[PDB]
Design a protein around this nucleic acid. Structure first.
Ligand SMILES: Nc1ncnc2c1ncn2[C@@H]1O[C@H](COP(=O)(O)OP(=O)(O)OP(O)(O)=S)[C@@H](O)[C@H]1O
Ligand SMILES: Nc1ncnc2c1ncn2[C@@H]1O[C@H](COP(=O)(O)OP(=O)(O)OP(O)(O)=S)[C@@H](O)[C@H]1O
Ligand SMILES: Nc1ncnc2c1ncn2[C@@H]1O[C@H](COP(=O)(O)OP(=O)(O)OP(O)(O)=S)[C@@H](O)[C@H]1O
Ligand SMILES: [Mg+2]
Ligand SMILES: [Mg+2]
Ligand SMILES: [Mg+2]
Lengths: 257, 318, 330, 492, 258
DNA sequence: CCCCGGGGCCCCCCCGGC
DNA sequence: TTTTTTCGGGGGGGCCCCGGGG
């Protein structure tokens, strides 16, 4: 219990992060460096990529002697994380060349400790380098609105088409039983700055996406109040949820023209 | 009395490959694998009570040393081995990270694998192929035919044969010397004859005889272990005169409490394995035995039906 | 369930201790010796109906645990579900856990195990092997061909013979003493003959005979009472029918058979069975006679088992016997 | 990180290039050509078949025996053309719901990993559904979904199985380009076996390689496994241990129906020495290899042999009659087995009555080619015609006084003279009258057509109906469709 | 409505009592006598023994002339009890030589009567004396915390090991995916004497129990705010929940240590 | 007052001897 | 060189809906 020691002030934060994307990917590699934790995963269909960054400022304490990698099955990690109370400090502990990690739940008001050991998995995956790309359209909208739109349009068709044009965002879910259309107009309210719908628009874009991947993405709405969507002509759409110190990004490949 | 004496089949279960009698070539190969390493996927098939589970467990123990608890996953018929189990638990065990000595791998022991469903066996194929660099699979079964061909292709087949009377005698004498058991040559001969190459049966019969009568002689052994009824049936079917066969049926089988269904099934099996008689005659006798078996299954399980079957067999053999 | 006197004699006279089990001295002595010195192995009891297997195992459980045996053993039978899931969960939990009440070993009794599926029997193998240090299994069966070889290899076998005559006589004497009944020697002989080594038949027939008496306090049960209540042919009837068949013409034999049957409403199957038993003792010069007798009588019995015309079947019996015995001349 | 000495040889010497795979060169080339022209076919909507004819199939189906190299070949052809592979196997859940959720959304979706990695085809998916034979299930098993996707997909699809001649694979009858992989020849594998033996430092006789390949029945993976296990201790594979090695590693393979029929009907095994070698237990086990089709094959092929086991004075016809009698007895036993009592304990007896005994009575040399059982198709045809007869009978119930069998045997021959003959004789003028009869018995045009097929022998209506002028049939159809008709079973 | 008449002022209490152990046993004999109702049942696997006692202080009125035994299937009894509102009094009624038990739900304010009858069953069970044992260790802790610990540990393994040592109680589970260990210490807070953990130790103990049985047992937490666990080597573990007048007890056999 | 986890049925698919 | 009947058991996929948490 010397190499890696990462103390979350509240165990709920890590559980929320895991729940954000545990239903899209199953086996994830978390690399802990001297700056923080980075995780990259690809779903079974190789269509959706999940990126997670947690900075050093997101921990009550953080100490990593040497860079380490930990392969975890998110199901078991969530199973363990459900055993912690809301008002408990969490500690991830690892040693050199670890076969397992230690999750320690500590309570200060009560002298009770809960130590769990999670067996690590051997995962052989290639780290894809996600270079920055100047997207055509940028959008920022409250997470609740996007989640409601996606859940409403999902039951109509297996696919949802987003058309961003001058001062307009259109979601269409034409299917078999019927069709659906929702039009969002950018607007800003000073009384409630957390409700404004911001759109920076350069080139018109019309992209079609699978509904199941949007349904998986919207599960991250808890982490961030406002979700950002960056869209290009053909490059994968980037759905980002911010975190106190870090972010959770979803890269979704559009359906071919 | 609330106490229990530990059975000798458990008290004297071999703990190393050197203590396993019979199948010298296979045990030597297992010993070489254990000494060297790089265990391949293997399937071990044989008849009951010859040392398959013992061999697999000894191999795993000697290969993995102190890492036995962490690097061995044992599943048998008494456990759940459905498609979900194969797809989740076995896969997780295969993907588990576990540092091991330079030439060792994790072992999955699927005992009595012949009872596994086709779907689970199909699911095992890619799990075996993908994680062969850290996990190896050992199957133990009684019927190798039940293992699907794709799995057999990926495994090494190590078939076990019935133990000879010499190996059984050696093991029995070792156990007798350890336990200080009073015995006579005829008693051991009877034990071996009734065991029919099943070491577990021989040891259990010896322990039962010692407990019930102490002295292990022919009389006590037969008082404990009954004469195999298949041999009585074989004598009945090969009798020269119909009167002798009927007498055997009435005295050695019917009056001993053997059911008609058991008698007819044993007759069918013995006639099937009666190489001394011509095949066509055996086929005719099997036809008659099948007629009688159908009649018994319809509910007429009387001694008259068996007598009629014997009479028809005698007519055929004339 | 008011009192023990409202029960059928088969259940009212069930042995409670090993000392009340008759006709199985070898097995009883061996199992008592095993229990006394704490050397009980896994047991298999193979035998025909009504020989004392269930009674013996229950008495052994009482001997080991006492009056509260029911809460210290796991008894499963054909009337219960004994699938693979049951073996995996209930039997496994019972075999791998300590006794609640005492600190002794644990007994599992799988009565009528021949009715268990192959999958459950296979699942039981490693359960038996793994928990031998603290658990023992007892299997009971009438048909050994339904038991897998793996299960047979793990058990010590005891065969329950058909009950000898002497055990039946002693149990009958006990029942007569308890019930205040009188049984004539010939009546006892007939009862033992018709029992065929099954105690349940003896008890049921004796209860029916008691119910058949006008005044059970003084009236005695004779062979006539036994035959009347069971509706079975008398030895004299069988002898007369056989003599008529073997020594008279077709008309006389047919008339004699019809008259004998109609006198007491006898069944043709009983006559055939009794005549077969009588003929089994005959010393026949030619084997063809016996062959034809056995084959034709078996065919007639099988035909009767499915119904048919009774008169034609009786004539067939007469003709078969006559034709078969025609071969004794040369 | 893993030492190369701790790897299985099947992994160490896996083919890393398409030219390193031994055998089935033609099938590999066919698959390469089909996958390389997938875009060209797409531009033509998969309508213009090419030189090889692989232009109308949007999905390939590779099948063959185990251990030939189907998976490696498919993977290598996928990588060589630059595509991205989306592979699934029996280790994953592939039911109706899971198939409609995961793979359905990838048949027309760009590969995010392909986008980030970057050829013009690296952003597309080549779905490889391996071990389709293991997809246990019917409509919900996902096999039907994969068959449907083989008809609709925007990217190449590859399906790998072992036994394509399986009922569960029927939905894939004509949906894919079939590609056969066959037992590779000994010469192709000999080079690799010699190379492996040289690298592993053990003695391998070149001649012994042929026997080893024969033992594994063209299973390269099993050959390498056997080589490893033998070299473990015995490093000298000489000619003094060929028999022991071959007998120790003889895979127990269940014979196929044609092979079962051929072996059971061979007269050699029924001779004294042949019976001593191939015992009765062996014959019963051969029956048990496939107990559902063996009796059918024996019944089909027991009249097409030249016997070599005839008794002195017995002719072929008498042996055939005895075999037929025992086949009838076996059929009765089979009826007993598949009843409410479920008397499966009689299965061995059936084996003797249905297959072994009749075969032994006519065993010899085949006088032709082993034919598949014709009883199944005949039974299906009988069921179809019985359903049609039931429909016709319950359409005419209100007018007739008979059962369906009586309708077939008595009524229909007279119905023909009022329904078909007037057309043949009068022509168009016979229209109305016919309809009148059709109205009195609630007959529909479909009922007319179905009735016109029951007749056999000298009263077959196929050619006769086909010869009627088209104008008469058109007038009949128009007149029937231009009027109201009564209905018997007015379900509500 | 002559021999046995017992009125629960609140019909929900009996429903809760039955629900506390309805998933453990099915056939139960209720013995009703002048001083109240008792019941003892053994699980089908014969690993768990349930003992319920309800005194006469738990009834608004209670009358029993002679001892009466009622054999019931707990599934049917739970079904019947689910048909009663929380604002209705519940009267249990039984007569001489009864073949049935009457459950009468009364709502005087709404003047609503709901009468149900449940057929009795012949159960040949003799009340087995649960002889008192001097346990090595005895602890008491809030039922909610024990339920949470059991539920959390059941996710890892099918067996849970409890170790009682000087000033320490440890619950450990080891499974395929990992392991877990929860350690608690005796703690007393005078401000709120309901979250306190009390322990009295004479000999340290270490016992392993099946997780499914503990999951079944923790369902009694709805009856009491505290649970008392008595553990002793070579004896069943006792889990007691205390009612207003009576209690519910679970005797669970430990797993063989081999 | 609304969403999510997980027990319980419901439906369908395949075996069956030594 | 292709493709069937019945109970009972077992397995496995699919919902359904109560309960509990937020
Ligand atoms: N070759 C052997 N040498 C010594 N003891 C043996 C041998 N074979 C069997 N036994 C003894 O019999 C007991 C059972 O042996 P097992 O290994 O369980 O046989 P098995 O082949 O696994 O039987 P099945 O196929 O599971 S019914 C062992 O504990 C040994 O005590
Ligand atoms: N040895 C015996 N001594 C005295 N009574 C016996 C004996 N055997 C059977 N009976 C009587 O017949 C009744 C039934 O005996 P059981 O022990 O049930 O026989 P069983 O062999 O277990 O029957 P099966 O195998 O289930 S058909 C007993 O209650 C006794 O009344
Ligand atoms: N044509 C081949 N050439 C060289 N090695 C082969 C060949 N076929 C099989 N092998 C060897 O056996 C191993 C497995 O080959 P596979 O590609 O899995 O064959 P397969 O036909 O797909 O087996 P199945 O159908 O999944 S049982 C390879 O890694 C090779 O080591
Ligand atoms: Mg074994
Ligand atoms: Mg019995
Ligand atoms: Mg393959």
């Amino acid at each position: 219990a010397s190499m890696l020691e990462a103390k979350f002030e509240e165990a709920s934060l890590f559980k929320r992060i895991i729940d954000g994307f545990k239903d899209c990917v199953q086996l994830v590699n978390f690399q802990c460096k001297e700056d923080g934790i980075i995780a990259q995963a690809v779903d079974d269909s190789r269509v959706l990529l999940v990126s997670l960054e947690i900075g050093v400022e997101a921990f009550q304490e953080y100490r990593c002697d040497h860079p380490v990698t930990l392969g975890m099955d998110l199901t078991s990690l969530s199973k363990i994380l459900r055993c912690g109370n809301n008002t408990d400090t969490l500690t991830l502990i690892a040693d050199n060349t670890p076969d397992s990690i230690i999750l320690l739940f500590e309570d200060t008001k009560k002298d009770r400790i809960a130590e769990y050991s999670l067996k690590l998995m051997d995962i052989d995956a290639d780290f894809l380098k996600i270079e920055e790309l100047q997207y055509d359209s940028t959008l920022s909208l409250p997470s609740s609105e996007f989640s409601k739109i996606v859940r409403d349009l999902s039951q109509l068709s297996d696919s949802i088409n987003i058309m961003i044009t001058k001062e307009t965002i259109k979601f269409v879910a034409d299917g078999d039983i019927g069709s659906g259309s929702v039009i969002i107009k950018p607007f800003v309210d000073m009384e409630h700055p957390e409700t404004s719908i911001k759109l920076e628009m350069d080139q018109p874009v019309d992209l079609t996406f699978g509904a199941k991947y949007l349904l998986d993405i919207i599960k991250g709405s808890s982490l961030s109040d406002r979700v950002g969507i960056r869209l290009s002509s053909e490059a994968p759409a980037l759905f980002q949820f911010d975190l106190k110190s870090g972010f959770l990004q979803f890269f979704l490949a559009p359906k071919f023209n | 009395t609330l106490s229990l004496q530990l059975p000798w089949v458990e008290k004297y279960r071999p703990q190393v490959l050197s203590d396993i009698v019979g199948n010298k070539e296979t045990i030597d190969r297992l010993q070489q694998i254990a000494k060297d390493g790089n265990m391949p996927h293997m399937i071990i098939s044989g008849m009951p009570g010859i040392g398959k589970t013992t061999s697999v467990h000894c191999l795993a123990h000697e290969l993995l040393g102190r890492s036995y608890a962490d690097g061995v996953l044992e599943l048998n018929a008494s456990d759940d081995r459905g498609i979900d189990v194969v797809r989740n638990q076995i896969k997780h065990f295969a993907q588990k990270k576990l540092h091991l000595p330079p030439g060792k791998h994790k072992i999955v022991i699927l005992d009595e694998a012949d009872s596994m469903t086709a779907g689970a066996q199909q699911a095992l194929r890619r799990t075996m192929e993908l994680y062969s660099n850290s996990t190896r699979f050992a199957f133990a079964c009684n019927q190798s035919n039940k293992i699907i061909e794709p799995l057999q292709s990926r495994c090494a087949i190590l078939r076990y044969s019935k133990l000879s009377d010499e190996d059984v005698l050696k093991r029995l004498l070792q156990i007798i010397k350890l336990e200080d058991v009073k015995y006579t040559n005829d008693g051991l001969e009877a034990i071996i004859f009734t065991a029919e190459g099943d070491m577990r049966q021989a040891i259990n019969n010896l322990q039962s005889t010692v407990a019930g009568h102490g002295l292990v002689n022919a009389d006590n052994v037969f008082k404990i272990v009954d004469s195999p009824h298949p041999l009585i049936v074989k004598k009945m079917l090969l009798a020269s005169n119909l009167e002798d066969s009927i007498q055997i049926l009435r005295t050695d089988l019917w009056k001993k409490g053997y059911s008609s269904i058991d008698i007819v099934t044993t007759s069918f099996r013995v006639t099937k394995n009666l190489a001394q008689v011509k095949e066509s005659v055996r086929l005719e006798m099997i036809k008659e035995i099948g007629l009688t078996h159908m009649r018994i299954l319809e509910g007429v399980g009387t001694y008259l039906q068996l007598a009629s079957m014997l009479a028809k067999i005698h007519k055929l053999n004339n | 369930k008011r009192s023990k006197e409202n029960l059928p004699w088969v259940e009212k006279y069930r042995p409670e201790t090993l000392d009340e089990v008759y006709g199985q001295n070898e097995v009883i002595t061996t199992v008592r010796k095993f229990v006394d010195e704490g050397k009980l192995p896994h047991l298999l009891f193979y035998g025909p109906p009504g020989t004392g297997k269930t009674s013996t195992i229950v008495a052994l459980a009482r001997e080991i645990y006492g009056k509260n045996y029911s809460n210290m053993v796991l008894e499963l039978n054909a009337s219960d579900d004994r699938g693979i899931d049951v073996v995996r969960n209930q039997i496994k939990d019972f075999a791998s856990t300590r006794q609640i009440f005492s600190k002794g070993f644990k007994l599992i009794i799988l009565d009528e195990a021949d009715a268990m599926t192959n999958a459950a029997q296979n699942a039981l193998r490693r359960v038996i092997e793994r928990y031998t240090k603290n658990t023992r299994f007892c299997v009971l069966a009438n048909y050994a061909h339904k038991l897998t070889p793996a299960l047979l290899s793990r058990c010590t076998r005891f065969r329950f013979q058909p009950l000898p005559q002497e055990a039946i006589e002693r149990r009958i004497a006990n029942v007569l003493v308890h019930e205040k009944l009188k049984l004539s020697p010939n009546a006892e002989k007939a009862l033992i003959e018709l029992s065929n080594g099954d105690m349940r038949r003896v008890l049921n027939v004796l209860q029916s005979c008691k119910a058949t008496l006008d005044n059970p306090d003084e009236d005695e049960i004779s062979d006539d009472v036994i035959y009347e209540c069971c509706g079975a042919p008398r030895p004299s009837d069988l002898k007369a029918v056989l003599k008529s068949i073997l020594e008279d013409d077709w008309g006389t034999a047919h008339y004699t058979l019809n008259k004998v049957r109609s006198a007491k409403g006898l069944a043709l199957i009983d006559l055939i069975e009794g005549i077969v038993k009588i003929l089994e003792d005959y010393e026949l010069q030619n084997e063809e006679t016996r062959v034809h007798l056995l084959t034709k009588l078996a065919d007639i019995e099988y035909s009767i088992s499915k119904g048919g015309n009774d008169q034609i079947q009786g004539s067939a019996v007469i003709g078969a016997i006559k034709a078969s015995f025609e071969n004794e001349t040369k | 990180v893993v030492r190369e000495e701790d790897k299985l040889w099947t992994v160490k010497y896996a083919p890393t290039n398409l030219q390193q795979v031994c055998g089935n060169k033609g099938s590999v080339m066919k698959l390469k050509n089909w996958l390389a022209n997938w875009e060209n076919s797409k531009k033509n909507s998969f309508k213009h078949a090419g030189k090889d004819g692989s232009g109308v199939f949007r999905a390939a189906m590779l099948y063959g025996p185990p251990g030939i190299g189907k998976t490696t070949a498919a993977h290598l052809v996928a990588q060589e053309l630059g595509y991205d592979i989306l592979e699934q196997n029996a280790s994953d859940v592939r039911s109706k719901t899971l198939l409609n959720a995961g793979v359905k959304n990838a048949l027309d979706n760009m590969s995010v990993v392909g986008y980030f990695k970057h050829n013009l085809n690296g952003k597309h998916f080549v779905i490889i559904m391996d071990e389709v034979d293991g997809m246990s299930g019917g409509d919900r098993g996902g096999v039907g979904q994969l068959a449907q996707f083989c008809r609709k997909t925007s990217t190449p699809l590859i399906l790998i199985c072992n036994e394509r001649n399986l009922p569960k694979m029927r939905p894939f009858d004509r949906v894919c380009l079939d590609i056969q992989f066959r037992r590779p020849d000994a010469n192709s594998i000999k080079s690799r076996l010699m190379t492996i033996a040289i690298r592993e430092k053990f003695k391998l006789d070149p001649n012994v390689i042929d026997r080893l390949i024969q033992t594994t029945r063209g299973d390269i993976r099993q050959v390498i496994n056997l080589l490893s296990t033998i070299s473990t201790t015995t490093k000298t594979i000489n000619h003094e241990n060929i028999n022991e090695i071959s007998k120790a590693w003889e895979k127990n393979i269940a014979l196929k129906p044609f092979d079962i029929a051929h072996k059971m009907l061979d007269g050699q095994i029924y001779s004294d020495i042949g019976s001593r070698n191939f015992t009765l237990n062996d014959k019963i086990a051969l029956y048990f290899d496939d107990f559902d089709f063996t009796p059918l094959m024996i019944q089909e092929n027991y009249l097409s042999t030249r016997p070599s086991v005839l008794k002195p004075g017995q002719s072929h016809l008498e042996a055939v009659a005895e075999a037929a009698n025992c086949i009838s007895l076996g059929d009765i036993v089979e009826k007993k087995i598949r009843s409410s009592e479920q008397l499966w304990s009689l299965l061995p007896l059936h084996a003797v009555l249905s297959s072994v005994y009749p075969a032994s009575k006519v065993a010899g040399h085949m006088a032709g080619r082993i034919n598949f059982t014709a009883w199944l198709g005949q039974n299906s045809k009988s069921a179809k015609y019985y359903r049609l007869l039931q429909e016709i009978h319950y359409h005419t119930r209100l007018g007739t006084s008979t059962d369906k069998i009586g309708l077939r045997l008595d009524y229909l021959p007279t119905f023909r003279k009022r329904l078909l003959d007037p057309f043949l004789k009068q022509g168009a003028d016979a229209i109305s009258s016919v309809i009148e009869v059709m109205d009195d018995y609630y007959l529909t045009k479909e009922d007319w057509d179905s009735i016109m097929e029951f007749f056999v022998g000298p009263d077959v209506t196929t050619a006769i109906i086909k010869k009627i002028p088209a104008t008469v049939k058109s007038g009949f159809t128009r007149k029937y469709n231009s009027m109201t008709h009564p209905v018997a079973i007015y379900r509500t």
